[PDB]
Amino acid sequence: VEEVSNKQIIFKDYINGFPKESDMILKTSTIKLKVPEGCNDAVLVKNLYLSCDPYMRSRMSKLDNYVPIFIPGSPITGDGVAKVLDSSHPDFKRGDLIRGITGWEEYTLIQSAEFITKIQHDLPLSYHIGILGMPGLTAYAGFYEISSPKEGETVFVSAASGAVGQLVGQFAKLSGCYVVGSAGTKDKVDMLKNKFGFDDAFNYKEEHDLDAALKRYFPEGIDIYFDNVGGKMLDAVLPNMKTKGRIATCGMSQDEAEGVRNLFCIMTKQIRMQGYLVYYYRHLYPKLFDLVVPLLRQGKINYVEDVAEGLESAPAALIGLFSGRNVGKQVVRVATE
């Protein structure tokens, strides 16, 4: 059996300030390319793609646990695409491509096996941690399952250039809705309208009065607000909601949180604001695939990712995501197939 080096991105220690590249350290360990004997229901994988997600910043502080905390001295963990090298688990074989929670390393011994799933098939492998993965399912559940979209309704999407937002907007146009998105750069604003079919889009940092901005695009209010940021943007959105409007709380800019002062609009506008966790909607994966996979090949839905090259660039890619410098879904390619 081969014994190879296993480069790893180790989590240094819990922090209190803004995360730095110094909080992760590249460590070259070793591993034998076989599931240990006596280790049953385990899967040894080689990691190909790693997901950089915004929820992972909270895992870097001793906050005790919406999302489980990073263990210092251990590798970073998160969603990814991997290839099964060996398995003591009946539902996985050599050469199977999987998606789920793996280690920020070249090779991982997944003992759980419950948080990984066989990849169904033609399209780029990295799509299964994006439009065909948890971000896609998140967009599907927040828009179709929770927001109850009707044709002709008005939709506003915050952080629209991200993986979730860019799919919500395309879902909105498919349902015949007028959709507007907000983003942080001119290139993202242009990308939202030139590639994702957004009816309009604006740069929320060049607009100092956000109420005037939303009135400009929604002269009669917003039916559906897909909330990726919360905070100040949600406060500006609340008085601009239509009666019986709906807010899908997918994520939150939130170390003191911005006070939200317009929640009386929940009553005066009769808003239904609903939060959700994508993990509670795994049963909708077939509906997502059955919808997006045909139109992905029919070229009516696009998807933009930001691929960092090599495991060594994963720290820089993560903090760049924390700093909003990513363009689309941030991804680290650890190895080719």
Next chain:
Amino acid sequence: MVEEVSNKQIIFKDYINGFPKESDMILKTSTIKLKVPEGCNDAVLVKNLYLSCDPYMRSRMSKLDDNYVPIFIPGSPITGDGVAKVLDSSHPDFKRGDLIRGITGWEEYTLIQSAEFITKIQHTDLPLSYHIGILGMPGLTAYAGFYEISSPKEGETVFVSAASGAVGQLVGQFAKLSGCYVVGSAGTKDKVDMLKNKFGFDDAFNYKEEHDLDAALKRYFPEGIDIYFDNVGGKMLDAVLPNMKTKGRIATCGMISEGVRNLFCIMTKQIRMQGYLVYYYRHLYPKLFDLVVPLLRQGKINYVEDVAEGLESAPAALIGLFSGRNVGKQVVRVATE
């Protein structure tokens, strides 16, 4: 021929932008002839008996864009829900001697030229003032929030803010009759003792004397809150948010104007927060009477009202309600019969 009598009125002075005061209303003695004017059709002349004081009337005293309620008119009497007796009528559905409830003037006599805002009172076995409280819009607000919004199940833990108020004292009782563990919050010792000894609440606390709201909620809800009936919002809603249960529900029944910063719990705990206006649920009135009238005769549900006497006391009763000095639903007896 026909009587010309004095008609005392409570006149609205002018729009405000602060905390309302008694000097925002002015007592005025006008005259009126006790007949519907000739050539004025579909009108109903009434003698007002009871006037309602409701929290939404604070918003009618300020002029904003997006007013959500029709504002008051300076120089004209205050208007609101009331119980009145018809003296004359040019309207087919109302005749002399009928007792009606609906929007009327803060005065001894009102010429109601609408009639769409008034309906005949039919039971007339219960006290007349009940038709602007437990059998009026507050009772209807309570029924809609509990039976149409909140989705309660038996054994669920329910929290009610402003539980001694009109809406709070009846959803908390609707919750008990469905088998819920119910706790309410109020401002004085007598109000806490009233929720436990008369409204059958499991427990209750004084939010002034238990200033650490998080510790108070943890003390009475060791396992979290399933349903929060929000009547105040603000810091109380902020303290409730991290104390909700997973998939908990918040029915925004009302709100009195502090920035909320724990809205991340909406996503963390998958909470549904939904607001509503009772004016969209007038069709549920028969359901309310069908349910509450038998429970009243059987003594299964109680109703506490605050009766101020004389039209002249209406300014102070209205401000006292805004200041929390009322004990239960605040009404004003203008005349008997």
